[PDB]
Design a protein around this ligand. Structure first.
Ligand code: 453
Lengths: 339, 621, 60
């Protein structure tokens, strides 16, 4: 049977892939990094608390100025903050109360957000009339928007609970490319620095690397035992990390095509909601449903730090492009800035 | 101490409360006095497309009321020339050929009956029904309707809402007093029955019955029955608010006047017949008809009163001997033997006889023995005095036939049979209905029993308000002034808002499900009530004080249940929350209570349903 | 859907794309990650605590 043949052939190929990876596993990251020095106490402290959301916070994103950020909340607003002053630059009442993601456009001109309305809404910040309006409602997903990241001010990538991700042309509102392949809700995405690739993590427990300009999946990383809730590129575009409900983060290498490291501990039993790298990649930061953000040593795999000032789940984090700071966002309604 | 309309925000809730009940239809709103009033104010003045329609509706309704043929000739000309002819000459007359032709034809045969334009009426309704209704709804005149319904639906009457004056009647279970309903100024009677006196004499069913019966006959504004506008109670008392009749009853006047000439009797009989008619069209038998249950008003016109012993025959025809000895038909007096309408027609005879002769036909030689009057009602036919004119003679023998199949009124067409008796040849029944006949008599200026929860369960559903009675009461008293005052009060709140900058309306441009005032406890240790403006979204309930935006909320996730609760002996909503916490809400009116209960429940269910399908939002173990 | 012949082909073609990439040794990947980190450890404020002076979130 044609169908049975294609099914065994897929197995053979999964096996071929597994063995090609094992032929590459000549050593471990942990062996290789075995004699560099630990990082010491990574002692970070809250410099700012951002108080204003009236309910759970679901997501945030730093502007590239390493200064403003957007946050998305159960209260049905985006707040755009100036973390230097704690001043709300904009507070944006949304059309749908069920927002769960958001993104600052690199240019600083636009933010995006969306959620259970299944739409990616593009708000324009600098109108000529000095007002904050929805410029686009990007519609086409048949499932909640779970994540979104602008490439520039006329293209944006989204991920959804419809198990796809997509690329959009803003001016027209069209869904120019569809990234299919996942078999579970897609939860998260992360653009490469060059923006010619991105990775996505899903409820299928797998992460996928996509080429933006060609619309296909290049590689598929497995090994988590449960949903991938978060994902982040390592700063040089050749590895990324994920955080999962299985309570581990994991580093996967593109060019070796496989897991290099797990970041876990018998004690940490709760799922990860969010991950980010320090500027140098040396540190992996992960928010956890136990209210903390652990700082891991990316090369060695040791817990190096903890950020502990949230009374509910840490639901999102982010590091500035200038590397000066970490934002955590929580189900307790507050964002905190740390270093 | 007088009616205050809730603010226009009340629309968010009432529109939804009504919608759930199917009440937002042109049919259901147009047919309410206040609804009609508001819809017409809207058409005439705030929409030059529907002005002509309603203007045309009203000219026809005026036409219907014209008393004479001379006058209907004149008005039909005008109405035709103005709302038909001209509208045709400008190809702008959205009605059937049938409609036009029906009227046209009739006019040239100068054929002008009161129903002349009925064909248009149905079609004018057709044309207002659609987009016009729809716009009316979007307008502030429908907001005004919501303001007025909310008052309606929140009526809870107490003795304290009336100014009680002098006693005007008494019997077994209580007293009637004249009163003023403070609100509107409207004069009524208040009939108070004592629940103790009742329980004692085991007439709990009889007081219940008088209410249910009143509730059947009180619509349609019958000027010959003493109808009900409200009923409420206290732990001690049943209270019916009834039509006020200051002139006392016939039995008193009978004995004051002596007997009545036929012509005098004729006046009374006519008006009574019309009242009987009204009740019979509503499948009610009064059963206790007699001078003393006929009251007079200040001018001498009369009405049937006290439906205690009255009875529905819409389904079960009654059989029991119930009335007053002297006036009860045979089928009445005969138990197991069933009877409908008929008995009133016989009592009518008996009572009519009694106004002519001072005694029931079946009460001979001052006799005070009941079993005697029973006997000679069942047994003997009616010896009618030499003096009874043949027409009267015909009527009384027609009414007092012992065989129901042989009794006037009972032969298939009801009251009409009786109206056609030659005894009434001289009456124009429209003039009787109009109360245009001069009345004969112008009234001259005048133990240790206990109460269990099982008693007060029997009166659980005694309270009601007759909607139409209330709207009419309001319509003719304070509706205009209150609309002006409230219009005026609204125009100032909108003046304060262009200046103090509360312009943007928080509840728009999003997914707000409903908003409105409620009151919560904000002091945990203190438990006072804070009125706040709430906004319900699908994932949360926000509220704000005045001036500032919302700074607190609950999430539909936090909420585990919504239930009614008693607080300061006021029905409130109790919200149980996540932590084993609690949140208490008081609404300003019953419909608001009902709607917040439903929507909160609905919203918390859906939100929990939804969140559970969403890995980023839900709880993880 | 799992009974779909087109879907099964799509899966196989995809696994073919994924299987036929050039892979490098984990030793090499890991070294390149190590080198990255050391080359930019200077530029990374979370790596050496840095003085209040240069940092906008302290003392201001
Ligand atoms: C018509 C009438 C009575 C009366 O005065 N009723 C009445 C009703 C409405 C009114 N509006 N203005 C005067 C006025 C008066 C007067 C009366 C008044 C108050 C009463 F509580 C009773 C009374 O208790 N009757 C016994 C009863 C009541 C209910 C059901 C069954 N049985 C009687 N007695 C009577 O025989 N007939």
């Amino acid at each position: 049977s044609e169908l049975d043949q294609l099914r065994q052939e897929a197995e053979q190929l999964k096996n071929q892939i597994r063995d090609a990876r094992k032929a590459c596993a000549d050593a471990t990251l942990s062996q290789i990094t075995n004699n560099i020095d630990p990082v010491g106490r990574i002692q970070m402290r809250t410099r700012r608390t951002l108080r204003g959301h009236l309910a759970k916070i679901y997501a945030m994103h730093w502007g590239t100025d390493s200064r403003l950020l957007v946050s998305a909340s159960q209260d049905g607003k985006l707040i755009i903050w100036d973390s230097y002053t704690t001043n709300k630059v904009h507070a944006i009442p949304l059309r749908s109360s069920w927002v769960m993601t958001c993104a600052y456009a690199p240019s600083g001109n636009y933010v995006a957000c969306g959620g259970l309305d299944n739409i990616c809404s593009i708000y324009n910040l600098k109108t000529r009339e000095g007002n904050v309006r929805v410029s686009r409602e990007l519609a086409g997903h048949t499932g909640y928007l779970s994540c979104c990241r602008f490439l520039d001010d006329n293209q944006i990538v989204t991920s959804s609970g419809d198990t796809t991700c997509a690329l959009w042309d803003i001016e027209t509102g069209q869904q120019t490319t569809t990234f299919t392949g996942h078999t579970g809700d897609v939860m998260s995405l992360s653009l490469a620095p060059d923006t010619r690739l991105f990775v996505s993590g899903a409820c299928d427990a797998s992460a996928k690397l996509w080429d933006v300009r060609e619309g296909m999946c290049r590689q598929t990383f497995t090994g988590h035992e449960s949903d991938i809730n978060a994902i982040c590129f390592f700063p040089n575009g050749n590895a990324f990390a994920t955080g999962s409900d299985d309570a581990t983060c994991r580093l996967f290498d593109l060019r070796a095509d496989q897991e290099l490291m797990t970041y876990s501990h018998d004690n940490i039993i709760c799922g990860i909601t969010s991950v980010s790298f320090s500027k140098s990649g040396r540190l992996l930061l992960a928010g956890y449903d136990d209210f903390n953000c652990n700082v891991w040593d990316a090369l060695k795999a040791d817990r190096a730090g903890v950020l502990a000032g949230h009374d509910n789940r840490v639901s999102c984090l982010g590091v500035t492009d200038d590397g000066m700071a970490v934002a955590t966002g929580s189900w307790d309604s507050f964002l905190k800035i740390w270093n | 101490k007088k009616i205050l309309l809730p603010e226009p925000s009340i629309r968010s809730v009432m529109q939804k409360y009504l919608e759930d009940r199917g009440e937002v239809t042109f049919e259901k709103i147009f047919s309410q006095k206040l609804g009609y009033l508001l819809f017409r104010d809207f058409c005439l003045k705030h929409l030059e497309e529907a002005k002509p329609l309603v203007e045309f509706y009203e000219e026809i309704k005026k036409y219907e009321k014209l008393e004479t043929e001379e006058e209907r000739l004149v008005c039909s000309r005008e109405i035709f020339d103005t709302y038909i002819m001209k509208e045709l000459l400008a190809c702008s007359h959205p009605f059937s050929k049938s409609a036009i032709e029906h009227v046209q034809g009739h006019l040239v045969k100068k054929q002008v009956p009161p129903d002349l334009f009925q064909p248009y009426i149905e079609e004018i309704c057709q044309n207002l029904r659609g987009d016009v209704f729809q716009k009316f709804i979007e307008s502030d005149k429908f907001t005004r309707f919501c303001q007025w319904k909310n008052v309606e639906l929140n009526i809870h009457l107490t003795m304290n809402d009336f100014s009680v004056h002098r006693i005007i009647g008494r019997g077994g279970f209580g007293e009637v007093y004249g009163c003023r309903k403070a609100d509107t100024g409207k004069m009524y009677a208040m009939k108070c029955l004592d629940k103790k006196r009742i329980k004692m004499k085991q007439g709990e069913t009889l007081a219940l019955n008088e209410r249910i019966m009143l509730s059947l006959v009180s619509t349609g504004d019958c000027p010959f029955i003493v109808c009900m506008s409200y009923a409420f109670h206290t732990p001690d008392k049943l209270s019916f608010i009834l039509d006020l009749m200051n002139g006392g009853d016939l039995h008193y006047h009978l004995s004051q006047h002596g007997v009545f000439s036929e012509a005098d009797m004729r006046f009374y009989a006519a008006e009574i017949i019309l009242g009987l008619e009204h009740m019979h069209n509503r499948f009610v038998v009064y059963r206790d008809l007699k001078p003393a249950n006929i009251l007079l008003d200040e001018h001498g016109h009369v009405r049937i009163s006290d439906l205690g012993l009255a009875c529905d025959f819409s389904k079960k025809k009654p059989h029991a001997s119930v009335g007053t000895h002297g006036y009860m038909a045979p089928e009445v007096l005969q138990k197991g033997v069933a009877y409908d309408s008929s008995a009133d027609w016989f009592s009518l005879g008996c009572m009519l006889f009694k106004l002519l002769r001072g005694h029931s036909p079946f009460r001979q030689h001052k006799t005070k023995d009941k079993h005697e009057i029973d006997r000679m009602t069942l047994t003997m036919a009616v010896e009618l005095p030499d003096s009874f004119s043949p027409e009267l003679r015909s009527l009384l023998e027609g009414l007092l036939q012992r065989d129901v199949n042989r009794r006037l009124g009972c032969l298939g067409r009801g009251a009409q049979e009786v109206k056609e008796s030659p005894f009434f040849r001289s009456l124009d029944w429209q003039m009787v209905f109009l109360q245009k006949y001069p009345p004969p008599l112008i009234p001259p200026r005048g133990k240790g029993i206990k109460l269990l929860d099982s008693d007060q369960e029997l009166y659980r559903n005694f309270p009601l308000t007759i909607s139409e009675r209330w709207q009419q009461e309001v319509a003719e008293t304070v509706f205009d002034t209150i609309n002006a005052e409230t219009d005026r009060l609204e125009a100032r709140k909108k003046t304060k808002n262009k200046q103090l900058g509360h312009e943007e309306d928080y509840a728009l441009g999003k997914d707000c499900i409903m908003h409105g005032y409620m009151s919560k406890m904000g002091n945990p240790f203190l438990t006072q009530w804070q009125r706040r403006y709430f906004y319900l979204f699908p994932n949360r309930l926000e509220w704000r004080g005045e001036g500032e935006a919302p700074q607190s909320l609950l999430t539909m996730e936090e909420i585990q249940s919504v239930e009614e609760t008693q607080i300061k002996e006021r029905k409130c909503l109790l919200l149980k929350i996540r932590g084993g916490k609690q949140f208490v809400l008081q609404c300003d009116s019953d419909p608001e209570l009902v709607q917040w209960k439903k929507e909160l429940r609905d919203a918390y269910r859906e939100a929990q349903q939804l969140v559970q399908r969403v890995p980023k939002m839900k709880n993880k173990p | 859907n799992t009974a779909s012949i087109a879907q099964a082909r799509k899966l196989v073609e995809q696994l073919k794309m994924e299987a036929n990439i050039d892979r490098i040794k984990v030793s090499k990947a890991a070294a390149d990650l190590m080198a990255y980190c050391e080359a930019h450890a200077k530029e990374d404020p979370l790596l050496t605590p840095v003085p209040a002076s240069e940092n906008p979130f302290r003392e201001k």
